[PDB]
Design a protein around this ligand. Structure first.
Ligand SMILES: Cc1ccc(NC(=O)CCc2cccc(NC3=CC(=O)N([C@H]4CCC(=O)NC4=O)C3=O)c2)cc1Cl
Ligand SMILES: [Zn+2]
Ligand SMILES: [Zn+2]
Lengths: 381, 781, 29
């Protein structure tokens, strides 16, 4: 374990340094905004998630040039049916880095954008020039105070601030949720709906994947924390859409913890029966988490997840280090043993001193989370 | 579209604040007691208390303090509501007419800000120069105490200390100095500041920042000639004055944290302290300079929320958990008790004697104050039954003429590897007791029990002790299948400090017959049994995010029939005919319908707005009432005659209202002896000991009563000049909407109490015709 | 040989055009 988790977050494969922007454009909640949509973006973006893009078509480059001077914000639709271009929800994206290159006589533009706000689609219009616009309504972030705020006795208000971690959590539950005896429910029930307890349980699951401490790497704000956790969870498009619909951070965290405990297997999306890997093999190779969005030479985005071992996969071609997302590793195309559908790539270290010597990178669009034994798919809260 | 009527049948009895002073006159000694939305004034006499006036405000009393500006004949009162409505009041008596006047009123709510974790704090300067408020972390609001400031304009001052635990004003300080205890990454510290009005800012405090106990919770302002301040925590009691520092660590208080206090001697020689366990201690300061401190335990009273000294050794114990008390000290003897129904956690309507006039049985109190209350009509008649342990649920059995109650006592871990109870409770003094068939230090452990009590004597007939690390959650009493025996059904969950979500649970069926409780049937489930209901001879139960229906077999067992895996956690469960309503803690509501023909469930409609739900109930086959966060009540409606499938599968929030109370239980029935204008009857219990009744109305009656509401608001004097429309508005930290589909019963009933000239002004579209209408309405509770 | 026909989506190297045209249909599903 000596690669460097900060290498992929920078997206070094894109080349020379880009012109960065730092001004944050954030619209009011429930406000109606008309924002353009990128055509070849089939990814479902999450707020706070980094998204790299390489555009080739002159229309895309022209739209980017027009946005660089304006608010630098575009929309990313959550295509439920990609064939008919149907989208009920989506996420805004703000360009934070850009660089134009006129290599080989064609206008190439490299852009790094970040998620910002969720939204509900009101109307979709397509202009005469091919590019499409969207009349959208900003979805509000429903922030809720502590469940005890409405029952808390005035005399015990001063005992709400707090200075063996297991012993500390027991004391925390007995003190913060003391007034729970005044309601129809006990303390342990409210503990399931407390942001801090949920964040700590998620932290315990995250430490299992990476040895980076939560003092700096993880944000303290439950809203930003929930969005960061969701952004690196390997789920199918339908479950991602459902999770995005959630307005409260508490429900988002509850759903995330439930998914992390339920879906222990990860099978092929096309096969549905071919098991590829388990959550035991998942580990974080990047600062964002185990899964992150990466762009390829042809502008296709892959929400790739890094795992230790993978099975039922055949390798196509020979290892290459060209446009590699993980510097110092060579990729080899990986296909499913049964359906022959592309699942990801096998990364092999170029040098012997590197550790781990080999790992797997699987694309989210080709995976399916599976619950063991026999049951259907459901996501609580 | 809904049209409902909400009235208060019992005023809130829970005491959240109390103060002493000279409010009515400089000679009379006044004691003011706040009970959420009500305020009561009493004159401290040699015999006891003399009631003078009881007023009803349009706000939840959050801060209540008395003070005397220089030049004033008597003390003035200051009240700040939960909705940030501040008002200064004066007492005026002109012979026999007693009215409370409003000197100044206004709202201090900022458009932006994060409400503090330690709640709203309100303090007044000793010389009465300004009012200091802490509403948002990092912002200290100052309200100048001027005669011209009738609008109560205020200004904010920036604070670098964000997590401030407590703050008070200092005595004997030439400048208005504030002393506060806060926390930072380095620990908890005490710090002082000088509030400057000319600069509208802060100046260097009189003393430096001293490090204190990591559990410092309370601050006490010491008056002259001592001055300075006292800091109370879990294990230490310190005194700071600048150069003078005293610190004592009495082991007598380590058992529990001190939460409330009051001054006994105006000079600052004696103070009273109250802990979480109901123990009352006395702090004594020895003397020009402070020689030493001393703490002596006086005795045990009700678990206090606030305290106050009256005179001649008489003390008032304002309790929120148990009955309020008036005691005598021989430095403790109980002199008088005042019934407190709060907190009500569950209740039931029973026809005990008359079989026509309903009676209510409620689970009130908590810990040693735990008790049962029996309420009926004659003024209401109340009967108290102490338990000395926390009651949870309740049920009635007519066949066996007995009640079943879930209870929980606290025991402490023994050194020998066992447990010991603190005091005698109902489960330990049971005439007959038992234990379940077992499977699988100083810390406190909750021991759950099921008590069977007689309906006449109220004796603890039986007490069944559940398994270790098990929590009883639900309780029903009904006949199932073709069995004529009536059983007590209980739902449990295995709680472990290592498992956040429970993965085990039981559903047990017991029979009470011939004075013996026997374990009839037992069914294991892989989750928590949050709630259960009788559904047309079958037993409906909720297990985590699933809803399961059980059938009672001929072999006297339970067999699963169908399952429904819900998108949310099934906490609340209600039924009517073949309709079932499921609800979670974050207002996510779902409707199901058991298809008799198909033998399964069907999702009918849903509405997922995230807000802390507290309780739910079915009004009729189309309307559904629920109580949620910020003391609000909402009503949803389905549309069976909707043209689109999208319209029928959605619930419309057709009713919104701000009750000002935290509801915990709903029941069907009424307390009055059964062309009525009211259809339906739903009783509800809260945390502050308030009981209310909600019913449905017709369109015409709703329109007339709403017009009457607007006309009444124009004539009725509001306590603190607060608009009734704003007080009854659905309020949350993000959105504040006005009331719709509701009629305030208290305001409608208040029409009979006003003078006749004002009655004529209201009905100026006939005063006696409206009196008859209001009388018919009052006859429902 | 040298595999000059490549997949724009994943980067699969192929010696013939027929091999590539079939592989691109696998991504369509
Ligand atoms: C405009 C243009 C014209 C021609 C080219 N021709 C080439 O450069 C030759 C190779 C090639 C040919 C065709 C497709 C590809 N496709 C990919 C290469 C690649 O590394 N990934 C993933 C794999 C895992 C990883 O670590 N990083 C990734 O980006 C690809 O998907 C490559 C490129 C461009 Cl832009
Ligand atoms: Zn496959
Ligand atoms: Zn491919």
């Amino acid at each position: 374990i000596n690669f460097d988790t900060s290498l992929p977050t920078s997206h070094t494969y894109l080349g020379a340094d880009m012109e960065e922007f730092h001004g944050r454009t954030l619209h009011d909640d429930d406000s109606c905004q008309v924002i353009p949509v990128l055509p070849q973006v089939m990814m479902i973006l999450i707020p706070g998630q980094t998204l790299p893009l390489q555009l080739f078509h002159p229309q895309e480059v022209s739209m980017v040039r027009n946005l660089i001077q304006k608010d630098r914000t575009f929309a990313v639709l959550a295509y439920s049916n990609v064939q008919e271009r149907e989208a009920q929800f989506g996420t805004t994206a703000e360009i934070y880095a850009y660089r134009e290159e006129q290599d080989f006589g064609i206008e190439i533009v490299k852009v790094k954008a970040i998620g910002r706000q969720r939204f509900k689609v009101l109307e979709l219009r397509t202009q005469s020039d091919g590019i499409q616009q969207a009349k959208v309504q900003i979805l509000p972030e429903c922030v809720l105070p502590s469940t005890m705020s409405a029952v808390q006795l005035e005399s015990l208000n001063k005992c709400q601030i707090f200075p063996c971690s297991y012993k500390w959590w027991q004391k925390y539950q007995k003190r913060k949720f003391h007034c729970a005896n005044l309601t129809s429910w006990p303390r342990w029930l409210y503990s399931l709906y407390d942001a801090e307890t949920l964040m700590d349980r998620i932290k315990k699951q995250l430490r299992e994947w990476d040895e980076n401490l939560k003092d700096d790497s993880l944000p303290s704000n439950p809203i930003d924390f929930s969005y960061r956790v969701a952004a690196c969870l390997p789920i199918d498009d339908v479950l991602r859409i459902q999770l995005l619909k959630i307005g409260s951070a508490i429900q988002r965290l509850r759903c995330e913890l439930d998914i992390m405990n339920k879906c222990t297997s990860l099978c092929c999306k096309q096969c549905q029966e071919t098991e590829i890997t388990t959550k035991n093999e998942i580990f974080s190779l990047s600062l964002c988490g185990p899964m992150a969005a990466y762009v390829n030479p042809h502008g296709y985005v892959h929400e790739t997840l890094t795992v230790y071992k993978a099975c039922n996969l055949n390798l196509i071609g020979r290892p290459s280090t060209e446009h590699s997302w993980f510097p110092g590793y060579a990729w080899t195309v990986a296909q499913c043993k049964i359906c022959a559908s592309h699942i990801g790539w096998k990364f092999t270290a170029t040098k012997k001193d590197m550790s781990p010597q080999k790992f797997w990178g699987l694309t989210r669009s080709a995976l399916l989370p599976t619950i063991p034994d026999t049951e259907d798919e459901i996501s609580p809260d | 579209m809904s049209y409902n009527y909400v009235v208060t049948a019992q005023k809130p009895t829970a005491v959240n604040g109390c103060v002493t002073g000279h409010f009515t006159s400089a000679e009379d000694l006044n004691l003011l007691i706040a009970k959420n939305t009500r305020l009561e004034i009493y004159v401290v006499t040699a015999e006891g208390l003399r009631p003078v006036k009881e007023v009803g405000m349009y706000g939840k009393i959050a801060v209540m303090e008395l003070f005397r500006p220089k030049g004033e004949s008597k003390d003035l009162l200051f009240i700040l509501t939960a909705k940030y409505n501040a008002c200064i009041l004066e007492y005026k008596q002109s012979g026999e007419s007693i009215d409370i006047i409003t000197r100044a009123h206004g709202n201090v709510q900022d458009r932006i800000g994060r409400p503090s974790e330690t709640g709203i704090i309100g303090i007044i300067d000793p010389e009465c120069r300004m009012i200091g408020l802490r509403l948002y972390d990092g912002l200290f609001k100052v309200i100048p105490l001027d005669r011209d400031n009738k609008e109560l304009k205020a200004f904010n001052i920036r604070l670098e200390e964000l997590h401030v635990i407590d703050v008070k004003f200092l005595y004997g300080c030439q400048a208005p100095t504030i002393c506060f205890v806060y926390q930072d990454p380095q620990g908890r510290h005490v710090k002082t500041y000088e509030v400057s009005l000319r600069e509208k800012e802060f100046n260097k405090g009189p003393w430096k920042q001293e490090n204190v106990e990591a559990e410092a919770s309370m601050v006490i302002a010491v008056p002259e000639p001592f001055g300075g301040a006292i800091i109370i925590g879990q294990e230490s009691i310190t005194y700071h004055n600048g150069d003078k520092y005293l610190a004592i660590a009495p082991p007598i208080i380590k058992q529990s944290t001190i939460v409330c206090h009051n001054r006994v001697d105006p000079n600052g020689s004696r103070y009273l302290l109250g802990d979480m366990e109901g123990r009352l201690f006395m702090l004594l300061l020895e003397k020009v300079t402070l020689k030493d401190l001393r703490v002596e335990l006086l005795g045990e009273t009700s678990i206090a929320e606030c305290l106050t000294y009256l005179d001649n050794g008489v003390v008032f114990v304002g309790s929120r958990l148990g009955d309020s008390q008036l005691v005598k000290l021989n430095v403790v003897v109980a002199m008088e008790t005042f019934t407190n129904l709060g907190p009500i956690v569950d209740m039931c309507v029973v026809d005990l004697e008359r079989q026509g006039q309903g009676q209510l049985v409620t689970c009130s109190g908590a810990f040693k104050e735990g008790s049962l209350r029996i309420i009926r009509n004659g003024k209401l008649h109340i009967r108290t039954v102490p338990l000395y342990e926390s009651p949870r649920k309740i049920c009635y059995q007519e066949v066996s003429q007995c009640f079943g109650v879930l209870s929980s006592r606290i025991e402490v871990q023994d050194t020998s590897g066992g447990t010991t109870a603190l005091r005698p409770s109902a489960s330990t003094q049971a005439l007959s007791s038992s234990v379940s068939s077992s499977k699988l230090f100083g810390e406190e452990v909750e021991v759950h029990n099921l008590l069977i009590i007689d309906q006449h004597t109220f004796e603890v007939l039986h007490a069944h002790q559940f398994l270790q690390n098990e929590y009883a959650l639900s309780l029903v009493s009904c006949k199932l299948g073709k069995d004529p025996n009536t059983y007590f059904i209980v739902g449990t969950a295995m709680v472990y400090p290592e498992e956040a979500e429970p993965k085990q649970g039981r559903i047990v069926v017991f029979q009470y017959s011939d004075g013996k409780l026997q374990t009839v049937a037992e069914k294991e489930v892989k989750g928590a049994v949050y709630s259960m209901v009788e559904f047309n001879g079958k037993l409906l139960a909720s297990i985590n995010s699933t809803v399961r229906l059980y059938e009672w077999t001929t072999e006297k067992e339970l067999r699963t029939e169908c399952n429904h895996y819900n998108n949310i956690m099934a906490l609340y469960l209600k039924t009517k005919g073949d309709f079932i309503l499921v609800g979670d803690l974050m207002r996510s509501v779902l409707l199901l319908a058991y298809k008799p023909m198909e033998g399964n469930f069907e999702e009918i409609a849903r509405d997922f707005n995230p807000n802390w739900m507290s309780a739910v109930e079915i009004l009729d086959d189309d309307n559904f009432l629920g109580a949620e966060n910020a003391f609000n009540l909402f009503v949803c409606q389905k549309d069976s005659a909707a043209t689109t499938d999208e319209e029928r599968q959605h619930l419309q929030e057709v009713g919104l209202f701000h009750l000002g109370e935290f509801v915990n239980v709903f029941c069907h029935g009424s307390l009055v002896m059964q062309s009525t204008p009211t259809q339906g009857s739903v009783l509800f219990g809260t945390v502050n000991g308030m009981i209310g009744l909600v019913t449905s109305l017709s369109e015409s009656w709703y329109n007339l009563l709403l017009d009457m509401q607007n006309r009444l608001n124009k004539v009725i004097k509001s306590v603190g000049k607060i608009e009734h429309s704003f007080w009854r508005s659905f309020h949350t930290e993000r959105k504040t909407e006005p009331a719709t589909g509701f009629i305030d019963g208290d305001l409608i009933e208040s029409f009979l109490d006003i003078s006749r000239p004002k009655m004529q002004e209201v009905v100026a579209n006939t005063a006696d015709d409206l009196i008859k209408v209001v009388e018919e309405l009052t006859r429902i509770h | 040989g040298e595999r000059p026909f490549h997949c724009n989506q994943c980067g699969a190297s192929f010696t013939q055009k027929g091999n590539l045209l079939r592989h691109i249909k696998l991504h369509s599903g």
